[PDB]
Amino acid sequence: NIGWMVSLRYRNKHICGGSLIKESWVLTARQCFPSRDLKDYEAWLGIHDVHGRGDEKCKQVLNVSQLVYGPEGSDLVLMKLARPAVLDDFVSTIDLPNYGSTIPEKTSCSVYGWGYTGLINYDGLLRVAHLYIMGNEKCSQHHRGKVTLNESEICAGAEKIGSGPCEGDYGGPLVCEQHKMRMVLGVIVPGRGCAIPNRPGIFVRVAYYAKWIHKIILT
Amino acid sequence: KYQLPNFTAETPIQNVILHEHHIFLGATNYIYVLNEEDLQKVAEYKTGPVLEHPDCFPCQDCSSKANLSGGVWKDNINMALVVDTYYDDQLISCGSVNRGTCQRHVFPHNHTADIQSEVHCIFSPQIEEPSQCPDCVVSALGAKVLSSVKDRFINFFVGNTINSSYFPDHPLHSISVRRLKETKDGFMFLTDQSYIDVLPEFRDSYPIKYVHAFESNNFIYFLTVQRETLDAQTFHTRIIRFCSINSGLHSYMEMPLECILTKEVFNILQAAYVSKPGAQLARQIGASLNDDILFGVFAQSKPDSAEPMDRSAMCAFPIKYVNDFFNKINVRCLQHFYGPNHEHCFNRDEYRTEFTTALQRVDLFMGQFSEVLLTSISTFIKGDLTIANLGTSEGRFMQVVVSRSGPSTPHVNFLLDSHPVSPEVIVEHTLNQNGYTLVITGKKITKIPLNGLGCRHFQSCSQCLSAPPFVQCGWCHDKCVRSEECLSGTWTQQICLPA
Amino acid sequence: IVGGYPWWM
Numbered sequence: 025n026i027g028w029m030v031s032l033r034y035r036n037k038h039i040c041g042g043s044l045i046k047e048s049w050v051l052t053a054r055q056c057f058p059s060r061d062l063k064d065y066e067a068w069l070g071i072h073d074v075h076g077r078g079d080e081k082c083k084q085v086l087n088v089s090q091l092v093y094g095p096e097g098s099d100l101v102l103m104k105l106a107r108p109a110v111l112d113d114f115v116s117t118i119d120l121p122n123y124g125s126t127i128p129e130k131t132s133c134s135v136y137g138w139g140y141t142g143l144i145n146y147d148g149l150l151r152v153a154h155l156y157i158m159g160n161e162k163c164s165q166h167h168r169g170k171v172t173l174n175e176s177e178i179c180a181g182a183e184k185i186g187s188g189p190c191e192g193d194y195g196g197p198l199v200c201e202q203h204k205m206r207m208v209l210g211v212i213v214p215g216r217g218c219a220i221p222n223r224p225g226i227f228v229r230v231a232y233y234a235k236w237i238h239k240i241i242l243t
Numbered sequence: 244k245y246q247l248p249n250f251t252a253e254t255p256i257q258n259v260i261l262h263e264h265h266i267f268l269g270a271t272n273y274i275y276v277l278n279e280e281d282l283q284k285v286a287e288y289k290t291g292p293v294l295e296h297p298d299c300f301p302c303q304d305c306s307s308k309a310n311l312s313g314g315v316w317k318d319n320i321n322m323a324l325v326v327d328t329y330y331d332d333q334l335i336s337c338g339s340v341n342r343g344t345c346q347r348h349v350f351p352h353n354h355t356a357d358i359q360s361e362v363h364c365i366f367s368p369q370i371e372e373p374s375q376c377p378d379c380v381v382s383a384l385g386a387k388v389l390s391s392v393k394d395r396f397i398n399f400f401v402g403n404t405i406n407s408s409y410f411p412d413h414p415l416h417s418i419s420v421r422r423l424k425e426t427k428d429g430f431m432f433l434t435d436q437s438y439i440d441v442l443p444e445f446r447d448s449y450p451i452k453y454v455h456a457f458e459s460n461n462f463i464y465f466l467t468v469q470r471e472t473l474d475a476q477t478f479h480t481r482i483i484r485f486c487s488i489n490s491g492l493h494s495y496m497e498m499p500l501e502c503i504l505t506k507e508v509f510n511i512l513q514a515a516y517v518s519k520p521g522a523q524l525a526r527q528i529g530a531s532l533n534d535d536i537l538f539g540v541f542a543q544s545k546p547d548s549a550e551p552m553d554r555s556a557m558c559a560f561p562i563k564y565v566n567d568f569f570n571k572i573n574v575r576c577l578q579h580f581y582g583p584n585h586e587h588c589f590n591r592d593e594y595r596t597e598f599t600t601a602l603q604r605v606d607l608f609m610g611q612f613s614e615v616l617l618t619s620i621s622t623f624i625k626g627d628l629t630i631a632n633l634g635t636s637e638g639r640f641m642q643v644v645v646s647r648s649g650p651s652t653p654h655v656n657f658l659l660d661s662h663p664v665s666p667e668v669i670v671e672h673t674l675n676q677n678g679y680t681l682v683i684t685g686k687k688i689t690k691i692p693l694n695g696l697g698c699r700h701f702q703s704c705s706q707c708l709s710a711p712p713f714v715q716c717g718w719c720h721d722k723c724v725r726s727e728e729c730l731s732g733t734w735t736q737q738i739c740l741p742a
Numbered sequence: 743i744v745g746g747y748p749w750w751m
């Protein structure tokens with residue numbers, strides 16, 4: 025199950041994805057915040073459909089009380105919910121990687137989102153793309169030397185076909201299995217074009233910011 | 244009279260862009276691709292004339308509709324030209340036609356000259372709020388476009404000139420910020436604070452000209468020519484400053500700029516160029532070697548109008564000192580945006596500021612160009628020195644040393660063309676500051692070197708010895724030449740006897 | 743998600 029997937033709503037319209045890492049804490053991206061007024065924002069939990077149609081028995085609508093911006097380099101933002109989310113079979117928390125951690129190249133990962141699909145008539149149901157971890161050397165080579173990669177970044181790309189996150193998928197997770205456990209290894213940030221065949225996705229490395237995350241979440 | 248790399252377009256050149264050793268010219272009805280080395284035409288793209296029609300919407304080609312009953316032929320005057328290297332290397336061009344829509348020219352992997360193979364039009368049909376047109380970017384009366392990668396997105400800071408010409412479903416904003424969707428299919432405004440427009444009541448009475456736009460220290464700057472007040476009969480030069488946020492235009496404050504002469508006010512900016520200072524000048528105006536300096540070419544106004552009087556002055560505004568004045572606290576509300584009598588003004592990101600006192604500097608050429616109209620400026624460093632490439636309304640081009648303490652004689656000084664020099668400039672610095680300048684004159688573009696234009700033009704020993712050291716000039720009995728070309732051997736850079 | 747599948751895949 026995928027109970028950690030959050031849908032951030034701006035002016036009663038889905039703007040971004042997010043990951044529930046603690047009962048009152050959501051890990052998202054800075055690009056998801058046009059207004060500085062936290063009243064225009066809402067967090068939806070326990071949903072499969074973007075409009076929350078067939079999941080009113082699970083849906084957990086919550087308000088945003090605080091916004092904690094990550095270090096200058098990161099495009100991360102820790103979002104505090106006005107009330108803690110109640111964990112059940114439909115709402116759960118995603119584990120974080122430890123500060124000095126890594127996964128090898130070819131590690132099977134998944135990206136989740138209610139964003140742009142390209143399809144004519146998209147149903148609004150949560151989508152997944154199967155990506156595979158790429159090392160920062162091969163990633164810079166695959167990106168035709170246009171961008172040098174920092175320690176704060178994580179690369180993952182699909183096999184042969186053109187697939188990955190796009191508009192509306194930002195803030196969402198790059199889920200990979202670490203030490204027999206599903207963890208949020210990256211955060212979906214705007215890329216250099218949507219789903220280009222053989223072009224891997226650049227995500228913000230969560231393992232790099234794990235020390236700052238535990239500083240904010242542990243309260 | 245010199246033999247320099249030159250190119251003549253069929254139509255006037257409005258914009259110039261250099262990318263991967265190629266010269267991209269944004270001209271009327273055409274985009275030309277030139278070779279960097281010899282300015283030879285490598286390719287061309289016909290952008291016009293375009294057949295306009297109220298029923299035939301933007302970005303759709305109505306070639307069949309040429310035989311109509313309500314269709315008009317319009318010339319595609321290039322208003323903006325940009326190279327995006329963040330997404331797959333492309334050229335963005337925005338013209339006066341199709342309500343100021345833009346189009347991306349994707350470059351094939353190893354063919355920068357190919358601007359024909361992959362062309363996509365940046366227009367998405369609005370369904371959420373059809374009252375707004377984010378793909379209607381550029382104005383025909385005047386438009387300044389500044390693009391930048393901000394928050395992993397390509398942002399477009401557009402300054403547009405506006406009149407009372409009402410357009411339903413497709414209107415235009417004065418100062419705004421929009422981002423390209425990662426799908427590349429279209430632009431979008433984030434909030435209601437993404438644009439700051441002139442009140443419908445003052446759209447025709449209060450015209451605004453956007454002369455220059457730049458990004459420095461995470462701040463977005465716009466250089467304006469507008470009236471002193473809503474009811475004022477005289478014109479002003481203003482510096483616009485706002486927070487480089489994608490979400491909208493935050494911390495919007497506008498303060499006036501003045502170029503004074505020892506008191507003589509050169510109130511109208513003709514051209515601007517932002518660059519680092521030379522060692523000598525850095526020390527002279529109290530600036531670091533890594534400081535950005537706004538070099539503004541200003542001109543005296545014809546009483547009660549905006550057109551210039553052919554009297555110019557040039558003064559340097561270091562952006563550090565510009566920001567110092569913005570932070571210093573007297574202050575008025577933005578009269579063209581807010582009502583001149585409304586509640587927002589009777590108070591004190593959300594609020595828009597207008598300064599009453601102007602930031603002023605003394606003419607760096609000390610009244611040297613007080614008899615000519617300067618229409619172009621581009622600055623560059625050669626050793627300890629700062630040199631300015633200057634364009635005139637007569638078509639004169641010159642290279643002269645910039646120093647706070649005393650003016651100098653221009654080393655380069657000649658008639659480039661009959662047409663005035665365009666404020667649209669390019670300076671390239673190839674290994675050890677020995678590069679070139681791309682100068683526009685009507686439908687002509689010229690490649691002038693940065694290390695001067697010869698030596699043999701200096702008539703007297705005085706003029707010959709007053710030349711800067713990079714020109715490597717010296718007097719040889721009766722002629723000003725280089726060391727290697729002195730026949731007799733009587734070559735000096737120090738002594739002038741009664742010749 | 744472009745080139746994606748429903749979450750349960």
Ligand SMILES: *[C@@H]1O[C@H](CO)[C@@H](O[C@@H]2O[C@H](CO)[C@@H](O)[C@H](O)[C@H]2NC(C)=O)[C@H](O[C@@H]2O[C@@H](C)[C@@H](O)[C@@H](O)[C@@H]2O)[C@H]1NC(C)=O
Nearest residue numbers: 294296299304305306307308309310311312313314315316
């Ligand atoms: C505008 O151009 C059209 C062609 O692009 C003309 O229609 C086309 O004219 C051809 C003869 O020139 C004819 O074979 C095509 O079948 C016809 N196509 C269509 C879709 O109608 C059009 O007017 C035509 O040409 C005149 C000489 C007459 O034959 C008319 O009956 C046609 O409609 C052109 N109109 C004008 C104002 O020139």
